Amino acid sequence: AAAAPSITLNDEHTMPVLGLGVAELSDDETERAVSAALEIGCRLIDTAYAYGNEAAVGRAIAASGVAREELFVTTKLATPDQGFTRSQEACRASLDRLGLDYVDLYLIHWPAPPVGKYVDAWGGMIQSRGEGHARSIGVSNFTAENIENLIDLTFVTPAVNQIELHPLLNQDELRKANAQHTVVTQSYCPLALGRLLDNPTVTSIASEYVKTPAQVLLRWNLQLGNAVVVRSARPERIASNFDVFDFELAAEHMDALGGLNDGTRVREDPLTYAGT
Numbered sequence: 095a096a097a098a099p100s101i102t103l104n105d106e107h108t109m110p111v112l113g114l115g116v117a118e119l120s121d122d123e124t125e126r127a128v129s130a131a132l133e134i135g136c137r138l139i140d141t142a143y144a145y146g147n148e149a150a151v152g153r154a155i156a157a158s159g160v161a162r163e164e165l166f167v168t169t170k171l172a173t174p175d176q177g178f179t180r181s182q183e184a185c186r187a188s189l190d191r192l193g194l195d196y197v198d199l200y201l202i203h204w205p206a207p208p209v210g211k212y213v214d215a216w217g218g219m220i221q222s223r224g225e226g227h228a229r230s231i232g233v234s235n236f237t238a239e240n241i242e243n244l245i246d247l248t249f250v251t252p253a254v255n256q257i258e259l260h261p262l263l264n265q266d267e268l269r270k271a272n273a274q275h276t277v278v279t280q281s282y283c284p285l286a287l288g289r290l291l292d293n294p295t296v297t298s299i300a301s302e303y304v305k306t307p308a309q310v311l312l313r314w315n316l317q318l319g320n321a322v323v324v325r326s327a328r329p330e331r332i333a334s335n336f337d338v339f340d341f342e343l344a345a346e347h348m349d350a351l352g353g354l355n356d357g358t359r360v361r362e363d364p365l366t367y368a369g370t
C-alpha cells in the first residue's frame with residue numbers, strides 16, 4: 095500500500111506528494127535505493143537522462159512486484175536534447191532505458207535561456223504526450239516568465255515545475271506564480287544538500303516534535319502545499335523520510351522556518367545555467 099497521498103495535476107492525473115529522486119547515485123546504489131523505497135510504500139521515482147541511471151531504475155521497477163499503474167515514474171529531458179524532433183527522440187530513448195511503455199511525467203530539466211530551445215522542446219513533448227509516451231509533461235527550474243512563454247507559444251501549461259526549495263530558499267514568489275498558472279510546485283533538494291540538518295532553528299524544532307531534522311524539513315515543505323522529492327535517499331533513511339504524515343508543525347514553527355529564508359541557492363542558477 096502507498097505511503098503518501100497524491101495531489102491532482104491540471105491535466106487530471108494524480109501524483110504522489112512525496113517520492114524518491116536518484117540524482118548522483120551509482121547503478122547499484124540506484125537499484126538499492128529504489129527497491130528500498132518501493133518496499134516501504136513509496137510510489138514516485140524521479141530520474142533523468144543526465145543521472146545515467148534510468149536502466150538501473152528500470153531493473154528495480156521490474157523486480158519490485160509493484161503494478162505499473164500504481165507507480166509514478168518521472169524522468170527528464172537534458173538540454174542538449176531540446177528541440178521539436180530531438181526531444182521526441184529523447185523521450186523514446188528514456189523509455190527504452192527504463193524498460194517502460196510510458197512515463198508518468200516528463201520534464202524539461204533546465205530552461206537554459208542562452209540555448210533558447212526550450213519552447214521547441216516543449217512543442218515536441220506535447221507530441222510525446224499525445225502519443226502516450228508521457229502521460230503528463232512539465233518543467234524543472236523554470237521561472238514564471240519561462241512558463242508564460244510556453245503557454246503563450248504552445249497553448250499547453252506545464253503540470254509540474256520542479257524547483258530547488260528549502261527554508262534557505264523558500265521560493266515564495268515562484269510558488270505563488272506556479273499556483274496562479276495551475277502548475278504544481280515540486281520541491282527538490284529539500285534539505286539544502288544537508289546544510290540545514292544542523293541548523294539551530296531546525297534542530298530545536300526537531301527536538302520539540304521528537305522528530306529528525308530531515309522529517310521537520312520535509313514536513314515544512316509539504317505543509318506549504320508542495321509535492322516533494324527526497325534526494326537520493328539511502329535505504330536506511332527512506333522509511334524515516336516517509337514518516338512525515340503523522341504530525342503537523344504548528345504555526346509558530348512554520349513561521350520560525352519561514353524566517354530562515356535568505357536566498358541561499360545550492361544548485362545551479364535557472365537564469366544562466368546551460369548544462370545538464
Ligand SMILES: [Cl-]
Nearest residue numbers: 283285287325
Ligand atoms: Cl537535499
